[PDB]
Design an enzyme around this catalytic site. Sequence first.
Site, PDB file in Angstrom:
ATOM      1  CB  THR A   1      -0.832   0.035   1.276  1.00 45.03           C
ATOM      2  OG1 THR A   1       0.031  -0.244   2.390  1.00 45.03           O
ATOM      3  CG2 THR A   1      -1.963  -0.999   1.207  1.00 45.03           C
TER       4      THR A   1
ATOM      5  CG  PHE B   1      -5.308   5.857   5.564  1.00 49.96           C
ATOM      6  CD1 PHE B   1      -4.215   5.003   5.454  1.00 49.96           C
ATOM      7  CD2 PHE B   1      -5.184   7.179   5.097  1.00 49.96           C
ATOM      8  CE1 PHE B   1      -3.006   5.444   4.888  1.00 49.96           C
ATOM      9  CE2 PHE B   1      -3.971   7.627   4.530  1.00 49.96           C
ATOM     10  CZ  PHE B   1      -2.905   6.770   4.433  1.00 49.96           C
TER      11      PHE B   1
ATOM     12  CB  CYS C   1      -4.984   2.492   7.999  1.00 52.39           C
ATOM     13  SG  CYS C   1      -3.260   2.129   7.861  1.00 52.39           S
TER      14      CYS C   1
HETATM   15  C1  HEM Z   1      -0.693   4.545   2.216  1.00 55.19           C
HETATM   16  C2  HEM Z   1      -0.443   3.152   2.795  1.00 55.19           C
HETATM   17  C3  HEM Z   1      -1.626   2.440   3.430  1.00 55.19           C
HETATM   18  C4  HEM Z   1      -2.945   2.365   3.049  1.00 55.19           C
HETATM   19  C5  HEM Z   1      -3.662   2.977   1.865  1.00 55.19           C
HETATM   20  C6  HEM Z   1      -3.614   1.548   4.056  1.00 55.19           C
HETATM   21  C7  HEM Z   1      -4.962   1.255   4.034  1.00 55.19           C
HETATM   22  C8  HEM Z   1      -5.659   0.517   4.997  1.00 55.19           C
HETATM   23  C9  HEM Z   1      -7.082   0.247   4.940  1.00 55.19           C
HETATM   24  C10 HEM Z   1      -8.009   0.682   3.825  1.00 55.19           C
HETATM   25  C11 HEM Z   1      -7.388  -0.466   6.070  1.00 55.19           C
HETATM   26  C12 HEM Z   1      -8.763  -0.988   6.483  1.00 55.19           C
HETATM   27  C13 HEM Z   1      -9.019  -2.418   5.938  1.00 55.19           C
HETATM   28  C14 HEM Z   1     -10.323  -2.989   6.108  1.00 55.19           C
HETATM   29  O1  HEM Z   1     -11.286  -2.224   6.479  1.00 55.19           O
HETATM   30  O2  HEM Z   1     -10.524  -4.212   5.924  1.00 55.19           O
HETATM   31  C15 HEM Z   1      -6.131  -0.660   6.779  1.00 55.19           C
HETATM   32  C16 HEM Z   1      -5.974  -1.388   7.958  1.00 55.19           C
HETATM   33  C17 HEM Z   1      -4.759  -1.622   8.604  1.00 55.19           C
HETATM   34  N1  HEM Z   1      -3.533  -1.131   8.222  1.00 55.19           N
HETATM   35 FE1  HEM Z   1      -3.136   0.103   6.689  1.00 55.19          FE
HETATM   36  N2  HEM Z   1      -2.727   1.138   5.039  1.00 55.19           N
HETATM   37  C18 HEM Z   1      -1.497   1.660   4.650  1.00 55.19           C
HETATM   38  C19 HEM Z   1      -0.311   1.470   5.349  1.00 55.19           C
HETATM   39  C20 HEM Z   1      -0.150   0.727   6.519  1.00 55.19           C
HETATM   40  C21 HEM Z   1       1.100   0.552   7.217  1.00 55.19           C
HETATM   41  C22 HEM Z   1       2.399   1.189   6.779  1.00 55.19           C
HETATM   42  C23 HEM Z   1       0.832  -0.267   8.288  1.00 55.19           C
HETATM   43  C24 HEM Z   1       1.771  -0.798   9.385  1.00 55.19           C
HETATM   44  C25 HEM Z   1       2.847   0.203   9.910  1.00 55.19           C
HETATM   45  C26 HEM Z   1      -0.581  -0.567   8.231  1.00 55.19           C
HETATM   46  C27 HEM Z   1      -1.264  -1.377   9.132  1.00 55.19           C
HETATM   47  C28 HEM Z   1      -2.640  -1.646   9.130  1.00 55.19           C
HETATM   48  C29 HEM Z   1      -3.303  -2.477  10.113  1.00 55.19           C
HETATM   49  C30 HEM Z   1      -2.587  -3.185  11.240  1.00 55.19           C
HETATM   50  C31 HEM Z   1      -4.606  -2.433   9.816  1.00 55.19           C
HETATM   51  C32 HEM Z   1      -5.762  -3.054  10.552  1.00 55.19           C
HETATM   52  C33 HEM Z   1      -6.223  -2.104  11.771  1.00 55.19           C
HETATM   53  C34 HEM Z   1      -7.296  -2.677  12.551  1.00 55.19           C
HETATM   54  O3  HEM Z   1      -8.307  -3.165  12.007  1.00 55.19           O
HETATM   55  O4  HEM Z   1      -7.238  -2.686  13.821  1.00 55.19           O
HETATM   56  N3  HEM Z   1      -1.183   0.068   7.176  1.00 55.19           N
HETATM   57  N4  HEM Z   1      -5.086  -0.031   6.121  1.00 55.19           N
END
Ligand code: HEM
Length: 456
Positions: free
Chosen positions: A268, A393, A400
Amino acid sequence: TIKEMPQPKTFGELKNLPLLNTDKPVQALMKIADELGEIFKFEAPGRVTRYLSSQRLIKEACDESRFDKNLSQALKFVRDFAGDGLFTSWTHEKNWKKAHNILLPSFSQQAMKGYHAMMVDIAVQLVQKWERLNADEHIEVPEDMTRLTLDTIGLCGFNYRFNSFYRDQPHPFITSMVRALDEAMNKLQRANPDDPAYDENKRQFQEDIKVMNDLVDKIIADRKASGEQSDDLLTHMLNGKDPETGEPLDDENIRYQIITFLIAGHETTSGLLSFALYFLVKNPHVLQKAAEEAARVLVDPVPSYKQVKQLKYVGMVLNEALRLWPTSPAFSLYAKEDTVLGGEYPLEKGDELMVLIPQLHRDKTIWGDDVEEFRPERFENPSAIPQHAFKPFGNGQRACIGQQFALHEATLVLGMMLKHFDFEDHTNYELDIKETLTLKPEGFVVKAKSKKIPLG
Ligand code: HEM
């Protein structure tokens, strides 16, 4: 006044599944959305979901008292190696709230001050690689952005160096992780998985899961033995206690969180950096404006945390790249109880919804008619953007957790790239968006001519 909803072509017992039997399913869904509107039904064998594209309906879907995160089939397959980490857990699973409570502080904007040095270490490696290219060479953008993000997450996540810039073939963990993700994504479009023709896939998949668990379990064990304290997430997880119960995460769950950070953040974030550089080289006036800010703000040999925060226009460039091509393009929700969506679509408890982010971000009633144009200035005043109109996000408590980390990383790196090089779209690259769990500009290449500015 109940309204019946649209639905694309069906294929007997196959329903709509054949329509996603393509290499670019999200872009196919976007076209169906253009054709059918803000909401359409989509069925597959034993499954049904409704794709939402308008801010009017998505704002209702984001009401957490009415809808909660659903584990899509893709997330269920990824759970085979991500386990009950944050990304692949149900909100009601004990370990989700426990890990969420423990990790949230470690992911705040304030916490980025502690990861900054490690992010700079890898960023300097990327810049030095490009400074060292000879005249006849070029840069493979997504490939280098992925080396950067994987190494940054490994270093900030558990103080481990994948040393991706020292290799042609990635570190074994990366090869296994990438292969495991690919297998999980490939299962989405294979009708007869039990066909013996897939016995080799299954064997390789189990081997890759073992490679990942063995490395991460070893690092956790080595850390507990030494008692060493570092500025990484692993130290925070070994020392954290859930405020609600007083319980710490156990070792297995810590391993799943580490794998999850790599899985959720590597592609991502690298895709975002790749799309942003793509839009910049395609819009020289915007690249010039962004380069002028980087030169004015990044006055030291190495960027400081505070300086990255001052790169306001670079931040707007990244948000506009996320508007056009949000790299985790869709998320799934389920209705908590029977409810009516938008006053016309009755839903039953458990019914699924899919938020089609690229389409939401092209809602003309929100953004104006020129939605396809790259204009960072749309983000000049964030307060003017309606609630739930911009959602790269995700949403609410299941948004996120890495958002501040991803944006700090991307802003830092893009700022350093703009300070240090002039860029050339030497092949007049034609955008080709490759789809996996995420989106990226496949084959995007550029040439970078150094401004010859010292990098401390
Ligand atoms: C621009 C880069 C990124 C984008 C666009 C992004 C996007 C997202 C999205 C859309 C979700 C929600 C997913 C869902 O509803 O099923 C999510 C969840 C998550 N992301 Fe990211 N993410 C990015 C970078 C990161 C990074 C760098 C990390 C770790 C340092 C990360 C860790 C997580 C985690 C752990 C979740 C789940 C949170 C939870 O449900 O408690 N993400 N992300």
